[PDB]
Amino acid sequence: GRMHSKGKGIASSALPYVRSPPAWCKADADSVVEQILKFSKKGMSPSQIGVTLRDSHGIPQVRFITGQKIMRILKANGLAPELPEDLYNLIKKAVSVRKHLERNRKDKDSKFRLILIESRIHRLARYYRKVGALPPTWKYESATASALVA
Amino acid sequence: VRQSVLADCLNNIVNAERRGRRQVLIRPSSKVIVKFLTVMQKHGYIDEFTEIDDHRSGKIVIQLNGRINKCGVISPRFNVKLKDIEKWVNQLLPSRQVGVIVLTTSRGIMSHNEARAKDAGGKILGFFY
Amino acid sequence: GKPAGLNAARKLRNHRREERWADAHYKKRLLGTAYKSSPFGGSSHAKGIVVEKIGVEAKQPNSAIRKCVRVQLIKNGKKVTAFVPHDGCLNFVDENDEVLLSGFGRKGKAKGDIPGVRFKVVKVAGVGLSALFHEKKEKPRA
RNA sequence: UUCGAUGGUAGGAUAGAGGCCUACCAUGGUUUUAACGGGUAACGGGGAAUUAGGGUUCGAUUCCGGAGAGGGAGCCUGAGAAACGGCUACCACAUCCAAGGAAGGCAGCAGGCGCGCAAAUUACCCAAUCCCGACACGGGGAGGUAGUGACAAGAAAUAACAAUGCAGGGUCUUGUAAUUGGAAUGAGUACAAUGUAAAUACCUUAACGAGGAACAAUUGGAGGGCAAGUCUGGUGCCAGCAGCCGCGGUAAUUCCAGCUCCAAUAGCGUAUAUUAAAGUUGUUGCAGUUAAAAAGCUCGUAGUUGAACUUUGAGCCUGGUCACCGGGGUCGUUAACCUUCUGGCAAAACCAGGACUUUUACCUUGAAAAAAUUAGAGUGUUCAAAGCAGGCAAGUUUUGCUCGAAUACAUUAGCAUGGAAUAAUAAAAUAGGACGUGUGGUUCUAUUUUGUUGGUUUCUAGGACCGCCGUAAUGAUUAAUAGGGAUAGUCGGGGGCAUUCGUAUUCAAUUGUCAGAGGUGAAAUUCUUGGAUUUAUUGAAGACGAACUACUGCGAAAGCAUUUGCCAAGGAUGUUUUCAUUAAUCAAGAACGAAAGUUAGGGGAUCGAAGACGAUCAGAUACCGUCGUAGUCUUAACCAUAAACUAUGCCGACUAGGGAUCGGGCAAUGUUUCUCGACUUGCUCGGCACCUUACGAGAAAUCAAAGUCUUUGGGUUCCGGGGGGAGUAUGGUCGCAAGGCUGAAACUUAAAGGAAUUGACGGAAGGGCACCACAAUGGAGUGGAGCCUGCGGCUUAAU
RNA sequence: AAGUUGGACAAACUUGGUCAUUUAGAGGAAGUAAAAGUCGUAACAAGGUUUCCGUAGGUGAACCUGCGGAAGGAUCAUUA
RNA sequence: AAUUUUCUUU
């Protein structure tokens, strides 16, 4: 049940039953933690952190060896972005759609998609303000959205 | 989206019983589902059930033996006092001797008859006969 | 379908309140039309004065003369149509006889083949029908 | 919110709080959880009617509270009145006037007028209940009693014992009695006792008081509904009957007269309001593909609903109505009344009592709670509606005893006790944390004493704030075949911009012979030896992307079909990636929204509303042919609906067998073509659909949903309450307009409608039959002529 | 006491705006019901131009036509 | 091509 679509896909990742560090691995916990910190300074999103670590370095799930989620590790070590990754990606997509619309005003489909993205951004922002991830006076303005992204 | 898991469990069980199958797989599982099933088990309508403990809500495989006609849920959870138990029994049960109404009494999930014995009302969960 | 939440009493009550106006019976009670525009303000009977006699024609498949009269109410000023039940009473009933008008028994609807008539006469000259018919009482010399 | 609407200060006024009022200072208070305004033929409640339950309606009225005394306003007296059987002024009425004036209020008890369908005596009494006063002694139209009725409930006059023959029945019993006769007769008549303030009445009193008009039972119906006539006479679609269907045109079981029968009974019918049936208001418990009904589609806030997970189980003691059940304490799993105050024990710690929900919703019990009324316990008003009394006690008459006048229903709402299952929020993140006879400090108070108030330092006891000390296991639920986001290869006739190509249509120029060309069923209009049409070359304009093209793809829908490039975005798939409940459905509010229609600019090839002619027809105004304006294309502004359809809302779970198709992924010591592609097979996810079947559903047609529904409850929006009137009128709102949205009432009607079946019909199809059908150059003919004869019309007397 | 000056409550009257209800009117445009009228035949069969919906135009009228949709069609079908 | 109409009942 897609929130803004009629699709009913169920594609996802099925984590293993064994919630333990890998039997054949030498991650050494702290080495991976500093490795994540190095990649965070390099400037890649936590999704890219897990993808690169799983595909190349060979750690299936980082929390299995580290004991905490990578976002928790980044927050604990201080490299915590002010805007959450999902909200940042949504606002960046909205900015790209708005730029496309302002250069090409006849794209009614893009206008409809911008409305959907705007609604999704507002719902996500309301959730984050309620939980406390963002200041209660966060708000979202299209004029300053470009400065918010950059 | 999913609203109540007991309703889905009872709908699947009654569908399997009507089809005539001797087993049914229920997902998701919960404490309310477990308490409902043990009440049905101590009353003899449902045989052994194995709770598959996953690192999730968890699944359960139930062995049936027929002898039940329909198990259903009562949504919303109406508040049932001691005096309203008879009215609910007349409204839902086939007769005064056959049929069980499950109430989430403050003492715990229990049948309407033993809820009367304990002299405590609650909220109506469902029924089976 | 219908709301079934434990806290949807207001929604259910409001929807029932809106939908109950579609009921013909509820509308006819709550509109006050009996006291607003109906010839009878809830009264069972009303006195009136005979205006004229009209020979209405029966509808299909019947064919006869209904022997009706027109009566002007004294308390409302509304001119209505009246039906004489028996036969040979239109000769007895003359103009200005102080007739009494009542319903027909169809809750204000036309009964039978009579077109556009909803009332019937019960008393003439303050003596009552079926009394002068059997020559038990006589019309006063008015 | 002016002229008090929300709050603060101060004052005034009030018996008293208070914007009740005044001065100043602030702009506040309510509201889609419906504020405010309007209507109410609305005094409110206890309560009444119907009664499976849930509900619906009523409640002026014997009890409680509020208002009024014709409508307002003011005021004295009095504790208590803004009193009206107290006063004053105005407004609308009535009255005596000598014309100067005077004077009132029955929505109190009686009585009168008027409105009326609609409702009583100008009566007696303070004897019972109580009230007032100076008070045994007085008064009370409060109140008790009676006169009047058709009705409000309860009991019951219009009968009945035998002889009698017939129909009988099986020697025992019912009926028609133009029959008798002695019986018990009560309604009344009178009188006596009792009753009562006086009575009336009830009870009670001897006694008079039926042989048939005894001292005449009625009201409706007799076709179905619904019970009881095809009986006799009068009319003949007329009178009429008739709740609906419906009967009546000379045989009328349904009209009016007679006979009899059926139902209730001193009562019955009719008119209206309401309730049950109405599962046609549907929370229980309706229906929405075709009968009325899913917004064209999407976003979105109130509102509603919201995955799972945090202490479960085993063994005892003791006492309770029946191998059983409810209730209190424990020990070990894992520490077992957390924490506080007080009292004790004392190396901190323990026991006892009180408080003990962070915070509710929920359930149980208790308290205080008006009676009547409802249910209901007891009880000889002769039973009963009743009433709350009453009983003992025949053998003494004893100046006595004995009992009851319960209980529940109530709980909406408030208060309190007990439980913590079901449904919620924070328990500490930058540790802002149980941290505590702990290492140090500061602020205040005297709950005590220094002699009594009062002033300071503070030992002392207490409240609070500042950096440190690991007391110890120091703190972040998995990540939902939920969701969002990211990532990789893809996929798409998804969107926009720029660009490329294709034939066809029309037109223009030029070249070749000549007679028709178009079109149609037939034609006809029109133009063609001035070269029509055709053929050939070149060019321009606009429109559109044939075949490929499919029970195939994409998009929220409307819709999207030539090549390439660019941009933004999207579904599915793969994933030991990321966040962690962020979710579903929506009022109000917004985006898109075919075609047609509008305003300005460009362009107008083809087709083509309006129109022009030309054929068909009785009339063609249309269907047919040619031409033809708006329009068909596009840009910038509009609107906003279609059979916008799958006539079928969205999300989630389950349910039977098979084979095709699209996109992705997995596997093949599979095939093939100079590392990949194509093809083949199996598995899986997500779509478009298909065949068979019916565990199941529906009224059926039919449906893998329209199933999991009388065995009725997963969540959430829209929408319908018989057919016309009518998507009309009015009102509001948007639009330049056309029109869009919302949207009645009066009146009328017994049907409208859906599915399916059998006939009939079809200028529908497919098989065939026929000189009462045709074909055959058919044969003979009739009708054309004159006459025989029959039928219409004419005439007469009948023709 | 008669009488006098101010203040507050304040009946009531004239006028203007607003709300609710009721009620005349010259005239105009509708629906509703008919024992046997005039005009023609739109729909129900391929109703004789298949029907219906939205929009626009026209005509004595049912109605006709242009554009886009639906089968509720008279086709569930041409795999070659 | 072309084919309009069948009063109210028994």
Q: Give the nearest nucleotide to C113, CA to C1'.
A: D242
Is B3 strand, coil or helix?
Answer: coil
Judge residue B40's burial from the number of C-beta atoms within 10 Å of its C-beta, 0-12 exposed, 13-18 middle, 19 or more buried. Answer: buried
Do β-strands B23-26 and B49-52 pair in parallel, antiparallel, or remain unpaired? Answer: unpaired
Are C and B touching by the rule of 3+ CB pairs within 8 Å?
yes
Chain C contact residues (CB < 8 Å to B): 4-6
Q: Please name the residue of chain C whose CA is at the shortest distance from the CA of residue B75.
A: C4
**Encoded tokens for A28:** 């050494």
Segment (H or E) for B108 = strand B108-111
Q: How far apart are CA C66 and CA A135, in angstroms?
A: 86
Identity of the residue numbered C66: R
Decide if B32 contacts B70 (C-beta within 8 A).
no
Identity of the residue numbered B80: V
Decide if C44 contacts C100 (C-beta within 8 A).
no
Decide if C45 contacts C100 (C-beta within 8 A).
yes
CB atoms within 10 A of CB A95: 17
As a rounded value in angstroms, the CA-to-C1' distance for A124 and D301 is 15
Are A and C touching by the rule of 3+ CB pairs within 8 Å?
no
Closest CA to B73 of B119, B28, B13: B13
Q: How far apart are CA C34 and CA C17, in angstroms?
A: 22
Decide if C73 contacts C108 (C-beta within 8 A).
no
Do β-strands C119-123 and C79-83 pair in parallel, antiparallel, or remain unpaired? Answer: parallel
Identity of the residue numbered C113: D
**H runs (alpha helix) in chain C:** 9-19, 24-30, 33-36
**Encoded tokens for A65:** 């060896």
Four-CA torsion B28, B123, B71, B98, nearest 10 degrees: 150
Upstream peptide bond of C61 is cis (omega within 30 degrees of 0): yes
Alpha-carbon gap: B22 to the closest alpha carbon of chain C (Å): 33
A136 part of contact set with chain B, CB < 8 Å? no
By residue count, chain B amounts to 129
Structure resolution in Å?
2.4
Task: Indicate which of B3, B53, B55, B56 best probes the interface with A, i.e. most A CBs within 10 Å of its own CB.
Answer: B55
- A to B CB pairs, distance under 8 Å: 5
Is B54 strand, coil or helix?
Answer: coil
Q: How far apart are CA C93 and CA C84, in angstroms?
A: 10
Method of determination used here:
cryo-EM
Q: How far apart are CA B4 and CA C139, in angstroms?
A: 81
C-alpha A15: how far from its chain's center?
A: 19
Decide if C58 contacts C95 (C-beta within 8 A).
no
As a rounded value in angstroms, the CA-to-C1' distance for A23 and D675 is 36
